Amino acid sequence: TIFQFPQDFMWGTATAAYQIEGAYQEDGRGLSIWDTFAHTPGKVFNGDNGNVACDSYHRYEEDIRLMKELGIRTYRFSVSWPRIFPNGDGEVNQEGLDYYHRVVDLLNDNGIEPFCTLYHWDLPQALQDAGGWGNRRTIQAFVQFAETMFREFHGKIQHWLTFNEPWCIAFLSNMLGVHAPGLTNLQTAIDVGHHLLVAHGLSVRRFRELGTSGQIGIAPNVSWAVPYSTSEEDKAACARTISLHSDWFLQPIYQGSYPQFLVDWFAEQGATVPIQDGDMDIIGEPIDMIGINYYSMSVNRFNPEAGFLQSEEINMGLPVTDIGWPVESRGLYEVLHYLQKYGNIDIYITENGACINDEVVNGKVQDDRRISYMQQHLVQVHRTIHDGLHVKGYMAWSLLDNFEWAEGYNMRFGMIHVDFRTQVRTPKESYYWYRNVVSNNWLETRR
Amino acid sequence: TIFQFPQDFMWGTATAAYQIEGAYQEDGRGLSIWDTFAHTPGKVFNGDNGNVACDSYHRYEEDIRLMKELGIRTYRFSVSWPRIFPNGDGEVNQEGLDYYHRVVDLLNDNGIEPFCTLYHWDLPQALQDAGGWGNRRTIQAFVQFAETMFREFHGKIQHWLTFNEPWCIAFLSNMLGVHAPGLTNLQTAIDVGHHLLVAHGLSVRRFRELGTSGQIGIAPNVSWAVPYSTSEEDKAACARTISLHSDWFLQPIYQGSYPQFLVDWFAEQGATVPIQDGDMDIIGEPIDMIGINYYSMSVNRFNPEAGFLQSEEINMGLPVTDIGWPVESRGLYEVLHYLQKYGNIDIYITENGACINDEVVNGKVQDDRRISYMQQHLVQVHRTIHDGLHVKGYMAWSLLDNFEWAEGYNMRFGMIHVDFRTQVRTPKESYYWYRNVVSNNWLETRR
Amino acid sequence: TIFQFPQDFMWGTATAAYQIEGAYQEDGRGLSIWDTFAHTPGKVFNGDNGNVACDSYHRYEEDIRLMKELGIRTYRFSVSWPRIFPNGDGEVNQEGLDYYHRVVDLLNDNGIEPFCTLYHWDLPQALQDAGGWGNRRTIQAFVQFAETMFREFHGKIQHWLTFNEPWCIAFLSNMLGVHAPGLTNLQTAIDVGHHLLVAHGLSVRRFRELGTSGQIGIAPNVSWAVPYSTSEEDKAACARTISLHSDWFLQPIYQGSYPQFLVDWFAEQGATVPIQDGDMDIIGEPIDMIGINYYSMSVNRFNPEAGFLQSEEINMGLPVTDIGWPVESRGLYEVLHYLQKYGNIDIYITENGACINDEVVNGKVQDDRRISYMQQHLVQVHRTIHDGLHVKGYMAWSLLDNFEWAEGYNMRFGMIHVDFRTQVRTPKESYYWYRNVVSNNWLETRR
Amino acid sequence: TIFQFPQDFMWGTATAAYQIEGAYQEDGRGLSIWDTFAHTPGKVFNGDNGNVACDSYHRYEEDIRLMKELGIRTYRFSVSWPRIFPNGDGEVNQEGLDYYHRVVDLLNDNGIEPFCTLYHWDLPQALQDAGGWGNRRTIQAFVQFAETMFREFHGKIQHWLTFNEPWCIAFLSNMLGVHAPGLTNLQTAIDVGHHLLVAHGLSVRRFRELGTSGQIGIAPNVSWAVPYSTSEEDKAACARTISLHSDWFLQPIYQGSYPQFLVDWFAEQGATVPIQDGDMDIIGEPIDMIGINYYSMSVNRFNPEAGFLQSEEINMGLPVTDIGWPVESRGLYEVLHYLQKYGNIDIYITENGACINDEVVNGKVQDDRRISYMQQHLVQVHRTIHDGLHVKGYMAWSLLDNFEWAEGYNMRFGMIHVDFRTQVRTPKESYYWYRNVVSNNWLETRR
Ligand SMILES: O=C(O)[C@H](O)[C@@H](O)[C@H](O)[C@H](O)CO
Ligand SMILES: O=C(O)[C@H](O)[C@@H](O)[C@H](O)[C@H](O)CO
Ligand SMILES: O=C(O)[C@H](O)[C@@H](O)[C@H](O)[C@H](O)CO
Ligand SMILES: O=C(O)[C@H](O)[C@@H](O)[C@H](O)[C@H](O)CO
């Protein structure tokens, strides 16, 4: 089957600052909660950290040449907040801004459209010390950061995302303790989620007030669960799982309220959203589009012992990637249609990829499983476009193998292999396959 | 995840006569349309035929010992019609009956419940010469055959199936020309389908009139298609695909009529069902259960050039078995729920398996992919039971690698490897895995 | 270095009934708590059970031929209680006795001295239903069982052990829930430990009263822990670890009391030993020797969160066997010297071995690591003998790969490989190495 | 288990001049007793010599870059005496001093603290001709050498060691004849040992008088033996073995006397220490710390035929490194605690490593066994620190594979592989593992 994509479909790859930039103390960069987290014994696999990670702070020219050869039209990357404001709240670091100018100018020189993610988890440690996202003052610090970037890069960037994966930032980091700052308190997770939504709304306002170039949105990671049985309880368990990742952040944005059933659920657990007057109006600031991060899908059932959402994932026996996630691409088709509850909004698949740990053998990386994974998901993308949904682009999660939060360098998601001992880049077989798809602008599945 | 099965769940394996019995001219056996078909250049891969195929006519004792060691409770097999009535219409061949007595007694001696499939495609050539299933006289010949078996094996067999895969017998064989007798005429396919339904109804009547032991049903192969787009036409294309395999045969049986939309469809193509007065009443004879044969699932779209049903299957990029079928077990969960339109009837998964061609290496057959396939499908079985559906048992398609109709011996579906050069049996790794599942009566998926 | 052993040193191998006998329902055998445990989802790896396990109930003649060729002088095996008394408390099953007569006569015919373990964890389910070892009536049932064996095998067996690994029977099974019956209650673990000690004392009395042949003892599994730091608390943590395995059972036997510090420890946790008047006097019945089971050694430190004994084992980086136990043979030398607190009693290393999962490749099992392990431990044995300790013999843990409780068949400890699919025995390279050591009666370590 | 190290723990690697510097006749370097020894047929394996050995005389910049990337804080190296004083006793060679200035400045430029070993066995041949260390005039020559280095490198080096492994210099070289000058006379070995102790004391005095920078000590190789039996004689045999390596040199230094029992032992063999008045007072000069070289541990027994110390090492069957040494890290914990007899002095593990001969395969050196070895020994280091002992740092024996005295290039101890045919350096897998440990400052053992 041949799947032709729209003429102006935006093809790309994506990275995040702390995962690839290698110069954590260079040019006045301050420490982030992730430096702190990775530097704590037991928080990240093997004690790995982003001190060097890919060294893209120095090797960006090479990476950009590689992505130029890929035939890609956009590059999603994130800005390291502590490089711009080493204290979070403070005096601007021109050296930090200079770095992004070098990167952005090179991208633009190469016809590659920057797709800027302002917040990709690297909150300056100084702000965390004051309570981090649990403190409304951090909202102010973020707006300052956003403004600085909007003004500095006004006509160089046309695509902006305020936050990347609000669920991970709030719940995975503050309720489950898996990601920095590693807390386990429902109330603080809810506080964090609410404050980042306020920060987001204010930043969009500034974007509009400053007359900044381009479009702006937010990029939540998307969850998709299907019930094991036809029971109302399994159905509810799946609604909770799905809704906390997306609706919890999208309903306030698009409809001016948090999902009542989840508000009630958390209330049962003694937690309440710290909503101040006009917070909801600020959060409802009109956005241009949203980024959607998708990787897997699950079959769940209600289980009172299954975590704070009492939703248990069943191991259905499906084959899994090297990080253990089952691959079932229909989930992408399903959430995209599910999200239509907010209207036929513009959606970019800002992240989609697979952990496949193949290494360099005979000078190549025969990552057939990543090609397989991508192929199945791109079919779903075409399928939704064919259904009339406004899915505008796709960004392969990871141009490069990188520091994969908590997993360390152990889990490879890149289309370009990076030997962390030499920093040597080796484009995988998926890279060359992707090059053909993005350059031809059509995909073909064959037996 | 641990999946506990019901106390009385019936575990088994299945075969078909022409695929495993090796003695096509022995003990007065007459030729079937399949001997004829396989003996024709170009009809079956490599000119393979069932002349010897496994030689189970002679090696049944060994096979039965192997299935006894498997911990299985039932064995589904089919009866070679031309061994009982070498002419189809004629004088009984006691030698043919003796063979099945040897098999059945041994099964019973070993506590293995026979699950008898009367018709598994081996129509005596003599009847085909007279028009085969296109001729109503064949219905009479079949009822005689059924009666003979019912009387001969009265208290030895408690589970009976009249026909196995009516869709393949009618459409694949008479419209698509892929299986014997290899015709390509819509009207004859429809005639065949209708006549086999009449034969089925009459045989159930005889079963009841003779007071024969056990329960009796029919075993259609089940189809499952999901639409590519949300269009009404893709939806219709999938209804046609799904309905021709099951509803076309189940609606007359359970509701007294053929699916009207398919009646109209075929009428558009100039074909009409040869329904005589009381045919529908005969077909509606109450049955005890049905067998369901499931292997794969597809995503289809309407396409006017896509065959007689104008339903095109999209290659979604999913991994496939060695015969090229994509594995997606949810399809089993879906049809089982879909079939509830006929009531919560008793259903046995009379066939489910995968073509995995692994051979003997280091004295074993490391068929991990078959274990994987089975594991995923058994989860769905448990899932439907947990939903309250009366799924009574499961039979792994193929105890032994065998003559795979049209594919020849090239496509292996067995849990026991058969080296066709020596007839040597080598239980695969899936055999030992299955032995544990059927003996423990619970399954466990692990990472 | 050459290590010459004493002229009359007793060399052997060992097994346990439920781990090797394959005929759990044969000849009237009743179910044991282990059949029950293994038949419960989640209790044993992969749902493995002892239903067939080696099939030594039928293949003992082969096994005995193999051990005769090994040059061994003794064979330690256990008696399946539910084969003798299918109800535990009840009427004798002559068929069960006959089996052991076949085994024992063959051993004796081959000049191999039987070393009989009366209790090796297979308590009849019927007794467990009544409270198992938590009920003093079980003590009576055990004495009946012991008497029966003493009278039946009077002049055929000269070495007897009442219980094998009291720590595992009591604490691992009733406090930690890892072994059958799988309970987690300190008090019941203590009850079980005390009742088995009473059963042991009474059985020794009967042995003496009946004038039965040979010597009789008990075979505790031995623990050995060394402190991480020189702190009093780490030292205490190690004393608890060491003492619960051995002193807890040996002090009542040899000195008429339980280790006070452990009595106090458990008292702090609200558990008290159910000591009735004269229980201690019964337990103090003089024994002829003890069997010692040794596998590993650890370095521990005090940790309040480290289980009921608040003793944490440090992962020192030492290489481990395939089941994950570090090899450090000095621990054997240490406990043997430590046990001298009870006098220079007769000690038999009734168990010592390693989990090394090597399989048959090129017709052999190149288990160099098991040879390595054994070699290091046999040096320690010689060392203690050279120090004047009365270490009388050594039995390699496992003649055959077997059902390894909770680990299933996944963990191989045998010197003879068993392909559980064919029951085919393949003596490992360690078997041939051991044959030379036991036949020459001296060991040689070489570079 | 996670082992956190002290904030200021000093991590490093170590080498010795003759083993790595490749330019034995370059820049006026005179010959040492080792050039002479290696140039004699039969003294060193395969006639290997240090003529080129690693060529670090020319490739130091590369090596230093590699150790900078390692994250190391100190580098232990030795000074080639015959490069400074080509005659030993004579006129200074500025070219030789210049080399070390290039090395030291580069180290300092890279934040790597030089740890200078003045004497690492390369005594100028000219002095050996006059009797070498057997002649007190050599003491004077050494003090001149020491002074020169102290004055030349005053503020560039902060850590100094006078002698490296006095036992090897005296006994292995002059009693056993294995190392240069290869003599076999107890009396001369004792003379050498005493004269080097006097040289050491005088050099420390000069260090203090000149007001040189840093701290100064001596680095004996440490021995550790445990008795086979509990006999007084085996115990004595172990005391002799242990004491000759350490106490023989440390007692005069810290307590002002030689171990009396060893004085008596040698007296029995007709040898006496040539102690002149005030020699002991000079030797007792206060030192800042000591370096400890540890590799293995043994189990010994008394044996009158077992060499001059009549101490036989038993082959306990333990796994060995590629040079044949058994690995048993507890020995490090034991000697460190044993050395507390001199007070809780500052101790640096100046050497610890393993001979693992893995080569470059697939572009890497998979030296898992060296990682294993180091991991076990670093646990012991942490353990002693946790016990309150002042263990200040650890230096992995060998940054690079090198000329391994008498073994030649056949025995590899490096963390960086050196292909002696191309001089190409290839950091081993242990290098990358060590980089993580030294950079994180904590170690983790995992299963
Ligand atoms: O939010 C994104 O998800 C994260 O930024 C990535 O850095 C993750 O590593 C990737 O999703 C794979 O888990
Ligand atoms: O009717 C069933 O289809 C047939 O009985 C089998 O013999 C098929 O060959 C099997 O389903 C795989 O194709
Ligand atoms: O108590 C003994 O340990 C048991 O009898 C064995 O059956 C164990 O499985 C074996 O020691 C392996 O650890
Ligand atoms: O005395 C030290 O030991 C030596 O400096 C090294 O050069 C040795 O060769 C190394 O220890 C290997 O044993």
Side-chain angles (χ1 to χ4, degrees), chain A residues 202-410:
Chain A
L202 291 177
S203 300
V204 177
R205 264 236 259 285
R206 291 304 289 141
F207 185 85
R208 301 297 165 51
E209 294 161 353
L210 291 167
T212 312
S213 295
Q215 56 182 181
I216 190 167
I218 186 170
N221 48 331
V222 120
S223 176
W224 197 248
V226 137
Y228 190 72
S229 77
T230 53
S231 79
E232 224 49 57
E233 60 182 18
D234 283 6
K235 181 177 179 174
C238 292
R240 290 195 298 277
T241 293
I242 293 167
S243 295
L244 194 57
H245 267 75
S246 69
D247 304 293
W248 225 63
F249 301 99
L250 296 182
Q251 197 176 310
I253 290 177
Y254 285 100
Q255 297 168 2
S257 54
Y258 282 97
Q260 194 54 227
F261 82 112
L262 275 169
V263 164
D264 297 349
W265 183 263
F266 294 147
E268 305 293 1
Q269 281 152 41
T272 50
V273 190
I275 307 173
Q276 287 186 4
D277 295 2
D279 274 0
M280 304 313 286
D281 291 341
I282 288 160
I283 298 169
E285 187 66 32
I287 58 170
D288 303 320
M289 38 69 172
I290 68 175
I292 274 309
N293 290 359
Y294 178 87
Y295 290 92
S296 196
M297 200 203 117
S298 68
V299 175
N300 288 41
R301 71 169 160 213
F302 165 63
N303 182 342
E305 307 299 324
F308 75 116
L309 295 181
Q310 297 174 215
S311 184
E312 173 195 350
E313 180 174 347
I314 307 305
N315 181 169
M316 304 292 284
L318 297 209
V320 296
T321 57
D322 291 338
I323 190 158
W325 305 343
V327 344
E328 188 169 7
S329 67
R330 62 185 281 243
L332 182 56
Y333 178 71
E334 299 295 326
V335 265
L336 287 172
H337 264 100
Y338 172 85
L339 294 174
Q340 297 311 289
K341 62 196 298 183
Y342 298 121
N344 189 1
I345 54 184
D346 282 3
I347 301 174
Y348 291 81
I349 307 307
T350 47
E351 276 180 33
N352 179 245
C355 172
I356 296 302
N357 297 333
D358 304 350
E359 290 286 73
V360 182
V361 179
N362 176 45
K364 72 178 76 305
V365 189
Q366 200 59 242
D367 65 338
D368 300 317
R369 291 146 68 222
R370 172 148 35 240
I371 289 175
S372 177
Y373 177 99
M374 298 189 291
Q375 186 180 243
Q376 293 171 242
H377 290 76
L378 289 180
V379 167
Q380 302 300 177
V381 176
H382 177 274
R383 194 176 177 198
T384 57
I385 291 171
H386 171 54
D387 266 336
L389 306 194
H390 296 320
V391 180
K392 303 293 215 268
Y394 174 95
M395 279 140 267
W397 173 256
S398 256
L399 176 68
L400 313 156
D401 286 335
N402 54 65
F403 171 73
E404 171 64 35
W405 325 108
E407 293 298 338
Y409 298 96
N410 208 40

Side-chain angles (χ1 to χ4, degrees), chain C residues 61-358:
Chain C
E61 297 178 86
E62 176 178 5
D63 297 348
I64 292 173
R65 171 181 52 249
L66 291 177
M67 73 181 103
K68 175 54 175 171
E69 302 169 357
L70 184 56
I72 236 62
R73 191 233 268 198
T74 299
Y75 175 50
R76 182 164 84 105
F77 63 100
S78 84
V79 180
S80 173
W81 188 349
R83 276 198 201 282
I84 313 306
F85 288 102
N87 312 313
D89 219 27
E91 45 285 358
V92 205
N93 179 1
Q94 190 58 230
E95 235 135 84
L97 286 175
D98 291 337
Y99 170 58
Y100 296 103
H101 277 115
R102 292 195 295 274
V103 176
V104 170
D105 294 342
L106 214 27
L107 287 172
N108 284 322
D109 284 349
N110 284 273
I112 295 163
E113 290 169 39
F115 211 111
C116 190
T117 301
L118 290 173
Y119 191 83
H120 209 308
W121 316 355
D122 38 20
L123 180 78
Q125 186 58 227
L127 298 177
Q128 187 59 217
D129 291 339
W133 285 112
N135 184 341
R136 292 187 70 105
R137 175 206 276 83
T138 303
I139 296 174
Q140 294 184 70
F142 186 77
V143 181
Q144 175 188 38
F145 170 49
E147 288 187 70
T148 303
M149 299 301 297
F150 293 160
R151 303 168 67 268
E152 275 295 319
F153 295 83
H154 177 233
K156 308 175 151 193
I157 300 181
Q158 308 290 323
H159 307 282
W160 307 82
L161 295 169
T162 54
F163 292 86
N164 172 262
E165 305 191 343
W167 185 87
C168 290
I169 297 164
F171 303 96
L172 189 60
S173 307
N174 298 280
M175 176 51 178
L176 308 171
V178 181
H179 280 185
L183 305 178
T184 52
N185 183 298
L186 215 214
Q187 186 60 80
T188 86
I190 289 175
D191 289 347
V192 172
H194 184 62
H195 296 158
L196 88 70
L197 280 176
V198 179
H200 162 264
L202 291 176
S203 302
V204 176
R205 263 234 260 286
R206 291 304 288 143
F207 185 85
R208 300 297 164 51
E209 293 162 352
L210 291 169
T212 313
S213 296
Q215 56 183 181
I216 189 168
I218 186 169
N221 48 329
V222 118
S223 177
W224 197 247
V226 137
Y228 190 73
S229 76
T230 52
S231 79
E232 224 49 57
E233 60 182 17
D234 281 7
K235 181 178 179 174
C238 293
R240 290 195 299 276
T241 294
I242 293 167
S243 296
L244 194 57
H245 267 75
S246 69
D247 304 293
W248 225 63
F249 302 99
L250 295 182
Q251 197 176 310
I253 290 178
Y254 285 99
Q255 297 168 1
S257 54
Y258 282 96
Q260 194 54 226
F261 82 114
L262 275 170
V263 165
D264 299 348
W265 183 262
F266 294 148
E268 304 293 1
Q269 282 152 39
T272 50
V273 190
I275 306 173
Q276 288 185 4
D277 293 3
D279 273 0
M280 304 314 286
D281 291 340
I282 288 160
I283 297 167
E285 189 65 33
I287 57 170
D288 303 320
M289 38 68 171
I290 68 174
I292 273 309
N293 289 1
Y294 177 87
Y295 289 92
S296 196
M297 199 203 117
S298 68
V299 174
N300 289 40
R301 71 170 160 214
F302 166 63
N303 183 343
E305 307 299 324
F308 75 116
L309 296 180
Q310 297 172 218
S311 184
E312 174 194 349
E313 178 175 349
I314 308 305
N315 182 167
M316 304 293 286
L318 297 208
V320 295
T321 56
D322 291 338
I323 190 159
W325 304 343
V327 345
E328 187 169 8
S329 66
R330 62 184 282 243
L332 182 55
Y333 177 72
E334 299 296 325
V335 263
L336 288 171
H337 264 99
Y338 172 86
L339 293 172
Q340 297 312 288
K341 62 197 298 182
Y342 298 119
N344 189 0
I345 55 183
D346 282 2
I347 301 176
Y348 291 80
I349 308 307
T350 47
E351 277 179 34
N352 179 245
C355 173
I356 297 302
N357 297 335
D358 304 350

Side-chain angles (χ1 to χ4, degrees), chain A residues 1 3 226-230 299 301 313-319 324 328 330 333 337 372 375-376 379-380 382-383 386-387 445-447, chain B residues 1 3 226-230 299 301 313-319 324 328 330 333 337 372 375-376 379-380 382-383 386-387 445-447:
Chain A
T1 315
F3 305 85
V226 137
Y228 190 72
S229 77
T230 53
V299 175
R301 71 169 160 213
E313 180 174 347
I314 307 305
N315 181 169
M316 304 292 284
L318 297 209
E328 188 169 7
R330 62 185 281 243
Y333 178 71
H337 264 100
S372 177
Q375 186 180 243
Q376 293 171 242
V379 167
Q380 302 300 177
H382 177 274
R383 194 176 177 198
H386 171 54
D387 266 336
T445 46
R446 298 194 293 275
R447 178 181 294 171
Chain B
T1 314
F3 305 86
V226 135
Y228 190 74
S229 76
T230 52
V299 174
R301 71 171 160 213
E313 179 175 348
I314 307 305
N315 182 167
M316 303 295 285
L318 297 210
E328 186 170 7
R330 62 184 281 243
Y333 178 72
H337 264 99
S372 177
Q375 186 179 243
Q376 293 170 244
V379 167
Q380 303 299 176
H382 177 276
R383 196 174 174 200
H386 170 54
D387 267 336
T445 45
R446 299 193 292 275
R447 178 181 294 171

